[PDB]
């Protein structure tokens, strides 16, 4: 085991920002890489086709400024960063991209933009742990 | 975030053994500590002399397995605090992670049951949902 390549999927939520702290903690003196991923949920997005395309382009643009600030923070600590924005089902794309990129670990929050108090584990994290064969570091949301 | 103190709860399963490689990968140049914990599940003990006999055999078997893990961890330079308790595994792991002030819990996705159809063991599901500590879930073999 060596944690050379990390997958860090973010939905720009407060809990995902806690998980960024842990991505930064994995830095050593060796060379390391972060796959920085945001998924635009296609289910939410749902001529007709023309309208869909234009809408998908708008969500993308609106996620680029957030991704650039994170990419710069991570580059400043010494990582190489591959940033990806993709339209699709979030838990499926995280699992697919962790396998395609050959990562050593996925570091993610326990909760995300919904963060309902009664829910004790978000559905993207629960599906990624159950469906991926990669190690998953689950960083918990703030206390109360 | 600094991973100075790790809680490594083991049931001595094959998936827990995979998780032990990840505990060793957390070693750096700095002083690190592992809380090595084994819970004897009280629900599998619950005639009274039969219980004590079973209890003793489980404690004896746990101490023998824990001694070898402890040395393997000390050999890579950890300080190890080894703990054996009788109780409910997920509850004891949540409680001892808090009481020891660990930085992270490193554990398997599955354990001694390891049923193919089950995609996350109930100990790990409970610890993720009840603990506020970061949890590194190490998955079972793909075989
Ligand atoms: N669209 C996404 N793109 C990338 N990562 C995401 C996305 N959505 C969630 N995540 C990741 O999953 C973690 C857990 O958030 P999750 O979405 O499961 O929780 P939630 O929003 O509280 O619950 P739910 O979506 O089930 O209502 C996040 O901290 C983030 O790391
Ligand atoms: N009694 C225990 N003591 C310490 N750690 C344990 C104990 N039982 C399980 N664990 C931890 O939990 C991880 C996940 O095992 P878990 O018990 O949840 O899976 P399982 O045995 O396949 O399923 P289940 O117990 O629900 O039948 C193990 O790899 C280990 O790290
Ligand atoms: Mn969500
Ligand atoms: Mn078990």
- Whole-number CA gyration radius for chain A: 15
Q: Give the HSE-up count for residue B139: Cα atoms under 13 Å, Cβ half-sphere.
A: 19
Domain that holds residue A118: 1-144
Residue of A6, A124, A138 to mutate for B, most B C-beta atoms under 10 A: A138
Pairing of strands A136-139, B135-138: antiparallel
What is the whole-number distance in angstroms between the Cα of residue B105 and the centre of ligand 4?
16
**What resolution, expressed in A, was reported for this entry?**
1.7
Residue A5 pairs with which residues in a beta bridge? A33
- Count of beta carbons in the 10 Å neighbourhood of residue A9: 27
Are A7 and A134 contacting, i.e. CB atoms less than 8 angstroms apart?
yes
Check residue B140 and report its DSSP letter.
P
| Helix orientation angle between A48-76 and A14-25, rounded to the nearest 10 degrees | 40
Question: Annotation-wise, does B77 bind a ligand?
Answer: no
Domains: count for chain A: 1
Burial environment of residue A29 by CB neighbours within 10 A (0 to 12, 13 to 18, 19 or more): exposed
Residue of B128, B130, B131, B140 to mutate for A, most A C-beta atoms under 10 A: B128
Dist. CA A40–CA A87, nearest whole Å: 4
Dist. CA A104–CA A108, nearest whole Å: 13
- Cβ of A138 within 8 Å of Cβ of B137? The answer is yes
Q: Does B47 contact A at CB distance below 8 Å?
A: no
Q: Which helix (H) or strand (E) holds A99?
A: helix A90-101
Task: Considering every ligand atom shown, identify the ligand nearest to the alpha carbon of residue B65 and give its number.
Answer: 2
Q: Give the closest residue to B18 by CA, choosing from B106, B115, B126.
A: B106
* CATH number of the domain that residue B38 is part of: 3.40.50.620
- At residue A142, the 3 state secondary structure works out as coil
Dist. CA A55–CA A46, nearest whole Å: 10
User: How many Å separate Cα A1 from the centre of its chain?
Assistant: 22
């Amino acid at each position: 085991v060596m944690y050379k390549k990390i997958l860090y999927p973010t939905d720009f939520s407060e809990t995902a920002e806690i998980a960024l702290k842990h991505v930064k903690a994995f830095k050593t003196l060796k060379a390391e890489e972060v796959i920085l991923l945001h998924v635009i949920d296609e289910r939410e997005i749902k001529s007709v086709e023309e309208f869909e395309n234009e809408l998908k382009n708008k969500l993308t643009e609106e996620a680029k400024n957030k991704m650039e600030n994170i990419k710069k923070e991570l580059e400043d600590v010494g990582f190489k960063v591959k940033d990806i924005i993709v339209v699709g089902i979030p838990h499926e794309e995280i699992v697919k991209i962790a396998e395609d990129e050959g990562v050593d670990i996925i570091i993610m929050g326990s909760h995300g933009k919904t963060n309902l108090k009664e829910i004790l584990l978000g559905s993207v994290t629960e599906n990624v742990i159950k469906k991926s064969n990669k190690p998953v570091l689950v960083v918990k949301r703030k206390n109360s």
